[PDB]
Every structure is written in structure tokens, then in C-alpha cells.
Amino acid sequence: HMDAITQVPVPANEPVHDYAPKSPERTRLRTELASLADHPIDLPHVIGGRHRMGDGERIDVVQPHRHAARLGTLTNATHADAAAAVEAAMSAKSDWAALPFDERAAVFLRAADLLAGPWREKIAAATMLGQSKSVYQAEIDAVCELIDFWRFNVAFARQILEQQPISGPGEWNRIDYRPLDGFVYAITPFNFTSIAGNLPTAPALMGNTVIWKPSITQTLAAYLTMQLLEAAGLPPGVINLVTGDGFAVSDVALADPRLAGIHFTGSTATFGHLWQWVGTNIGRYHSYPRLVGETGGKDFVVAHASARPDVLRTALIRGAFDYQGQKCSAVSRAFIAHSVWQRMGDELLAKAAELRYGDITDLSNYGGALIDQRAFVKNVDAIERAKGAAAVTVAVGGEYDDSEGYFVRPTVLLSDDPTDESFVIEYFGPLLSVHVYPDERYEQILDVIDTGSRYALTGAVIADDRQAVLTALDRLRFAAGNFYVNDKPTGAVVGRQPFGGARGSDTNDKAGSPLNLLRWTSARSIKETFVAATDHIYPHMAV
Amino acid sequence: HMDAITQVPVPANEPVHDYAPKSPERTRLRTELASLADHPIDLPHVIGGRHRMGDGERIDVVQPHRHAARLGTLTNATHADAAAAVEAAMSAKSDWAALPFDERAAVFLRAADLLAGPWREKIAAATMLGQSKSVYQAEIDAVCELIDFWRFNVAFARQILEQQPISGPGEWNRIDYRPLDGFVYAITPFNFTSIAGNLPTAPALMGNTVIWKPSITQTLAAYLTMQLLEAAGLPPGVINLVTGDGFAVSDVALADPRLAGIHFTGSTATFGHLWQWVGTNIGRYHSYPRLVGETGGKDFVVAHASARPDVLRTALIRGAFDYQGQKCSAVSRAFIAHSVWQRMGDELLAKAAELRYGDITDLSNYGGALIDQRAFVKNVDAIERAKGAAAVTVAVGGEYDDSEGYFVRPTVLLSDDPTDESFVIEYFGPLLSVHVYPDERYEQILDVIDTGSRYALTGAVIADDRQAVLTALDRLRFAAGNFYVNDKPTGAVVGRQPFGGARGSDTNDKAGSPLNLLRWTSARSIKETFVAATDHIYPHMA
Ligand code: B12
């Protein structure tokens, strides 16, 4: 037993290592890079703690910047593999939910310290190699953000647990944060090793069990993430990894009456498809399935006449070209005051021209390749559509070559008129559209942005002038979900920029605050009355 | 302007007046009962501040316990009325959302004090007459719970506004809790004047505008709630009241691209139907509609051998027969240890036989009538089913008569085998089923309750024995939302028993905690960087 009201350790953001030359973390990284690249492995399903290749199609996972180089081979989950994954989750449920919160949380605090130290460069490396991330992009994702999700989620959970009610005289009211009945299906994207780790573990912390279907191109890091959790003491069957395209896994998972919920990422249309499925089929489920996730988007930057040019320039380059524009959203549209364009236009383009994309094992590169052949094709199409469109010049970039890796150069489009949002969402890649507007039209450009922005997760204003900043904060209040003043608009740091979403979204329960964790619990109130009534009659009834 | 970081008043639960003989409130209540009873009124739509009857069918609102006695007449909203309610909500948005939080909050704090004082017995009486509540049932709902929702929601909202993030070095991070874009559609049931007032006001607090469709049989108190709100200063068009059956209003609201959300009550099938509609048609909405609600259900009590017999008896009587069994949930099944039944069975039956249901203007009655003819038929069918079924005996009650009011007597059924949940959910009414179990089969019975209960909102254990209590808290952990020890399982007091829901439901965002108000906001993070980078190159690159 235990007689205590315990505290969890206090989280803080994990520091980002730089991997500068001569640094020890850089030497460690090269060891890990060579080790993963030179020793490709089977990437098996992990079900009830057993690692097994299955009977489905074998699919290679390769380095996107060098696609002839194999990192591993997975088998596409069959229906049978998925049914086994589910049975394993249901079978581990009882022992996992009975562990006290403090002991489930130690698993993830431990996993976090393991990722911060001895696993750090292995997980960074795996993310670099599979997902074509520069070391800095791997470090802010697979190390830091994943570490922070675990440590802050443990703190968020613990805070949820002490949210208790008032007891009136003669009674005692308490609240019990129950885990869900049934299993949770986590489907994770290629873009972040952190999201891939978090979507399955967050519900797990609150006492649930999980089946987890990672994106094929992220599966090296996902499998390693699974080994890390096992080394931290995650029990068998609490999370069950199934590799592949996910088709057979969804057939099975969505037909099972024990589906408690789905933690995923996707478009508005994906959400509506799932709503439609679950609403139509609601009588088939024991519980009402919970559908918790976030979308992608494309973002914008507006520079006022007071914008600092070098700040603006650097925000556009990073915002648009960090990770080859493949974050959950990237900067696709810049609106730049004419006088500020005269000062930094040429520098933007020259630097964009010099910006090196190549093999990420060469640490001098800024970034790597696009994630796969389908992504490449989408970019090529968007470039060809721009070369032949009226409005648009290709001012720099637009070259591409899939012979060695899925390489697309940084590309700046100049549009004579405000760039239409519908074009920029058809791909994810290093393509930035710029529209130069007359300084005195700042307010009109803000209205144009507002009126033509349905798909931005984030926006930024660059301006030293306070009225200009405030006017943007007012006028674009609903045009994006996270807003930035004098920096690139980008991925949040955990605990710092929670929430957001594109216009009209309902996704404030996504990862990054306690609201996510709540979705993985079902609270009940318990009341005890000490001396209840012994007569049913009420004072109003007396003669 | 304003330079301040203000606090709101600290909410405490509103005290329940007893209305004892010779009490001042009882006199004031009789005054208000007569005024409403003797002076029936038109019950109009309230659109953009304008109180107007429409061209739809005329529908009388009557006293359910005296259905010859009209309280008012409403007009079934047409599509045109519904479209106008929507445009009015959209026209009022801009000025409402631009009011500072404190000024929006003050409207609901003021309405709370008005309801506590000058409007108190008027709103209670309206609820007594139209919904057929005893004075105590009106008081805990129409007065106290509704006041508590307003005062507690204001404090919850203010608490949300101060949840703010960490700023690291060189930056400032903040969070802005924006109202939604577009309108919120609130649809409210007959059972509670409190829910009916809260569902439309809660999102409004957060800066939204609303159309509200109340239940027909609750429209008297709804219209008077609307007036109380206008008298607290609610601006025109912020909440727009459309009366009737909802059909046309749902047609218009659901077809409008500006639908931001629906705040309602309903069954799992209703949620599923709305989910299917919104998902299938999601491409037509500017925002993803938010569907926020709760369900009803039917509850149980289990008595261990160690139960206090009088506590159980009272809990059973109140839990099943308070408001004629017509709360969101009511106690429909009791599982009683044989030795405790020997001790309070006869007394339960006798007290239920003597229990008086009648015209609630006679304050000596325990309760009134069922809400409408539809409800009454469902009860009759359930009583005749029970009589016909071999499993079940009618131990007391079972009489019914709709000639003057929709009256059904407290009824107790004796089931030789554990009573099946599917039977109890096809009516709301004063029908309690008792199954007597052998003392030593306590754990077996807890298992049968667990296995057989999917529709309980609440459950209770009556037992002085601590192991027995704890065994119930563990074994029935998932069998019900809110769980009660040595008391009747019923509706929460605000801030005391939040959350709950039936097995496997997903409604912790329902009214009664801050989570509900968050559903009516869209939070964004704002970050300002003071000295951002001027070179894009990274240290790893050297
Ligand atoms: C919804 C859906 C679509 C949607 C997705 C977006 C939307 N909702 O508007 C759309 C219409 C675009 C689509 C298109 C097609 N899909 Co489809 N679709 C699905 C469905 C019914 C559910 C997917 C889902 O939302 N899963 C939940 C999300 C959260 O998980 P996810 O892993 O992120 O899912 C993504 C992928 O499934 C991807 N996707 C969907 N379909 C296809 C097909 C292929 C070949 C690929 C590579 C990817 C892909 O889209 C999802 C959203 O990003 C499945 C059924 C199933 N068993 O998976 C099929 C299914 C995957 N689709 C299929 C087919 C055949 C198609 C099409 C070839 C023809 C068509 N128009 O339906 C194209 C191919 C698209 C492509 N990328 O090459 C087949 C594939 C059979 C196989 N290869 O084994 C499936 C299994 C249906 C079936 N059994 O017949 N599909």
C-alpha cells in the first residue's frame, strides 16, 4: 500500500543541443548515423511485447535523400496482425489500469530521461535518416519535443487529478478520473517523431491501452521509439505497433465494438469521414468513440513598412524552408511592404539560391529531401503550374531531381496579385510565394489575408511599430490559430504556445495542454452523505 | 479604457428556501401562482429583441396537472422565423463580442441576483405550473440551480482566462480565448428550467450569439427567463428565442454555413444522427460545428445487509418519485438484501401508497402530474406490460387517470429476477422496480448490476459497512457516472458533483465545470520575440 499525496517532478523544456563542430554530441551522432545506415534491419510489428514480421507485403524504408539506401523493411499489417494487436491491448488493459498513476507515470518520466541521455543521438539519427531531417530538425522534434511531451504530460495529468469539488456540510464529494473502456487507435504522420511517440503514449499514461500505426517513412524512428519505451518498463501489450499503410488496421479497428477512440492527424475531410463513420455506426460501439486530432495547414507572414528587414528575411527562409517545408504547416505566403522589399528582396533570393539541400549525414547542409516520391510529384506539379501561370514568376529555384533523392530546391514565386490560398495547400515543400504591396495599403492587405485565409495554422506580423502590431493582432485575430510578432510562425514549444488550429477548427484538445489528457479519461463524481434523511416529506407539505 | 487585472465575485451555492407554512416566500409564491394561472399570455418568439408571434401553428401551453387550464399560446416557428433568429444572432455578434469580458459577465451576475430576489417566486411559479413541479422541485431547479450556473460559470470563465503559458528567455507568450465564428444553436428539454436557461447563456458569456429553441411544455418559464435576461441588460439579438417543435429551426440552423455549434440534450442515437449529418456535410460549414451535450438515463440503488433501512426507504422514495420520476434520470431499479427488505418493505409500499400527487398549487402534495399526453401513454403502456409479464407483480400503485391531469400514481414493481434495464428506459415516470436478493449474494448482485447496466447516469450504495461501500465503488466503477454512498442518487448541485454520464459516454464537457465554457472558445497562442535571429544559418552547419 501507500499513504501519501505525492507530487510529480516539475518539468522544464529540454535544452536543444547545437551539434557544433568539435562538440561531443556531434561525434556521438556520427557513430549513430553510421550504425543505423550500415546495418538495416527488419522493422517488425510489436504485439503483446512480441516482435514479429507478419505475412503482408514487404516494404522498404529508405533514406529519402538517398533512396537507393535501405534502412529497413517492414511487413504491411494484415487483418490478422491487426486483430492480434487489438486482442493484446485488451489483454494488457486490466493490469495497466490497476497500476497506480505514479507507476504508470514513471514509465514515461524514465523514457524521457533515457531519451535525454543514452538514447538521444540514436533517436535523432534515426529521425534524420528516415525522415530526411537535418540534425537541428531532428533535435527539436525527436529529442526535445518528445521529451517535453512526456514530462509535461505527466505534470498535466497530475494537475488534472487534483481538480476536485467542494464538499458541503454533511457530505464528501470527490472526483475519480477513470480511464476509458476499450482500446485507442493512434495513427501518426511522417512529419514528427515527437507526434508519433506522443499520440500513442498520452492515452497510455491515463491508463489506457493502444494500437499504433505509424507512417511508413517514419517507421525506423517509430520502432526505435517502441524499444525505448520497453527499456523504460512499458508493459507488454500496453502499446502495440502495427506497420504499413494502415488499411487493414482501420478495417479491423473500426469494426471492433471496443474502439474507445482515435488519436490522429488529418485534414478536415478526414475528420468528417470519421465523424460520418462513427455517427452512422454508433450502435455498434460499447462506448462513444472519441476522435481527437489536429490538421495541417499553410501559413503566412505579413511585413509592415516598419519591419526589420533581416528578421523578416530570416523568418521567411526558416519558416518556408526549414525541413523542406514539411512541418505540419509551413510558410507559403508572404505579404511584404514595397519599401521593405526594396531593402531585402535581393538578399532573400540570393540566400534561397545558395541554401543547400542534400544528404543530411553531411551536417553542412541546411536540409534534406522530400519524404517520398508522391510528395515529390506533388511539388513538381505545383512548380510546373507556376511556370505556366499568368500571375506568377519563378524568381529563384524551381529545379528538381529524383534520381538520387527526392530533391526540390527552395523556390520563390513572385505573384503580381495576392497569392490565392488554394494553390499553396496542394503540396508540402520548399515553395514560398511573395506578394509585394504598397506600404500605404497595409490595412487592405490585412483584410485580403483575412478574407482569403481558411488554411493557416499560424501567422506572423513583422513590425516594430506598435500600432501596426496591434492592428494585425486585431484584424487577423481569427485568420490563424497561433500568431507571432517579429519571428517566424512555426511549431510550438511544449508548454509555451499551446492550442491554435486553422480558422474554425475545433482542435483545442490536441496534444500540448491538459485538455488532451482529459479526453483519455472519464470523470465521475462520488458523493458520500454522512447522515441522510430518514423521512421523505418536505417542509412545504406541512399543513 | 481600463487599466486593471480584475477579479469576479466569488460564487457560493444559493440557499434553498423551504416555503414552510406562514413563511414570507410562501405568501409571495401564492401571489405569483395566481397571477400566472389567471392571466394566460401569448408566448412569442424573441428575435433581435422583438417579441413577435409568427405565422405558424398555434399551440397551447397548459398545466399538466390541470390540462383544461391554459397558461399561454405559442406559435410553431416557421423557416422564416428561424432564418430571422439566425440573422439577428449574426447582427448582434460584433457589438457583443467586443464587450469586455467583465461587462458580459455582469449581465449574468445581475440576472443571478434578480432571480435570487425580485424574480424568484415568479420564475419558480412558472416552472411549477408549466412543468408540474412541486415548490421544492421548482426551487432547486428554476431558482437555485439556474442562479448557480450563472454565478459559477462567471467564475469558471474568469479562471480559464488566466490559464496562460510560460514565457522563455527573450519572448512573451500569451493566450487569447476567442469566441467562436458564427452562431450557437441551443435546444433545451422540459425537465429543468435551469438547463433551459444555461444552455443558451453559457456560450453567450464567452462572446457568442445564440438561437434558442426551448421545449414546448417549458416555454412559459423560458419566455419569463428571456424577460429576466433583458431586464439584466442582455442586448438584443444575443440570444434569440424561437418557440415550437424545432423541426423548421433545425432545418434552417443545420443548413446554415455559419453554424458554430449545438448545445443540447439527447440520447446516443441523437448524438450519432447529428455526428453523421455534420460529418457527411462538413464541406458546407465555415467552422467545424461543435456538438456539446448530455443524455438522460435511469438509475439504480443497491442495499447491502448493513444498510440503514430508513435511509434506504427515503432514498428510494425521493430518488424514484421526486418530480414524478421525470428528472434527467430517476431511480428505476433497487437491489435490496433480503434482511433489509424484511425491515422496510412494508413501510416502502405503504408510504408510496399514501404519497400525494395532485395540483401543485396545493402545496401539501408531494408532486404533480406527468408532463404531457405522450409521456402519459408511455407510462400506461409500461404499467400494462408489467401487469401482463410473469416476472413482475404490481406491489403498490399502478393506477392512472388522464381525465383532469396526466396523473400516474407512485408504483412499485416486484421482480423475482434482477430487473432488466431495457424495460425501465421506455418511459419517464414514478415506476420503481425492486428486486430482493439474498444477503450473501451481494458481490453476485454487484456483478449482475455491472453486466446489465448501460443506461445509468447515477448509482447508489446504501451500506454502513466500509468494505461493502468500497467493494461497490470498485466493482460498479464503470456502471454509472456519478456514484452515491448512503444517499439518493440524483442531479448534481453545481460545483459539487460535476461530470458523470452513462457507461461509455463522452460528455465531460457538459454544463457544470469549466470544460463546457472552453467549448465556446477557440484559444490561440500569441508569441512575441524581442530580438529574433537575423541570420538563418544553424551552428551545426559551420
Ligand atoms: C477516406 C478514404 C479515401 C479518401 C481520403 C481523404 C478524404 N476523406 O477525403 C480519398 C477519396 C482521397 C481516397 C482516395 C483513394 N483511396 Co481511399 N479510402 C479512404 C478510407 C475509406 C478511410 C481512410 C481514413 O480516413 N483512415 C483514417 C485516417 C486517419 O488514417 P490515415 O492512415 O491517415 O488514412 C489516410 C490514407 O488512408 C490515405 N488514403 C486513402 N485512400 C488511399 C489509397 C491509397 C492507394 C493510398 C496510398 C493512400 C490512401 O488517406 C487517408 C487520409 O490521409 C479507406 C478505408 C481503409 N480501410 O483505410 C480507403 C482506401 C484506403 N482507399 C482505397 C482506394 C482504392 C482509394 C483510391 C485509389 C480510389 C478512390 N478515390 O477511392 C484513391 C487513392 C488515393 C491516393 N492517395 O492514391 C482503398 C485501397 C485498397 C488498397 N490499395 O489496398 C481503401 C482500402 C478502400 C477500399 N478498400 O477499397 N480514399
Ligand code: B12
Ligand atoms: C432523427 C429524427 C427522428 C428519430 C429521432 C431519434 C433517433 N435519432 O433515433 C426517430 C427515428 C425516432 C424519428 C421518429 C419520427 N419522426 Co423524425 N426526424 C428526426 C430528425 C431527422 C432530426 C431530429 C433531431 O435529432 N433533432 C436534433 C435534436 C437535438 O433536437 P430535438 O428537438 O431534441 O429533437 C427531437 C425531436 O425532433 C424528436 N422527434 C423526431 N421526429 C419526430 C417527429 C414528431 C412528430 C415528434 C412529435 C417528435 C420527433 O426526436 C428528437 C430527439 O429526441 C427530424 C428532422 C428535423 N427537421 O427536425 C425528424 C422529423 C422531425 N421526424 C419526422 C417524422 C415524420 C417522424 C416519424 C413520424 C416517422 C419516422 N419514423 O420517420 C416518427 C415520429 C416519432 C414521434 N415522437 O412521434 C418529421 C416530422 C414532420 C412533421 N410532423 O412536421 C421530420 C421533420 C422529418 C423526417 N421525417 O425526416 N425521427
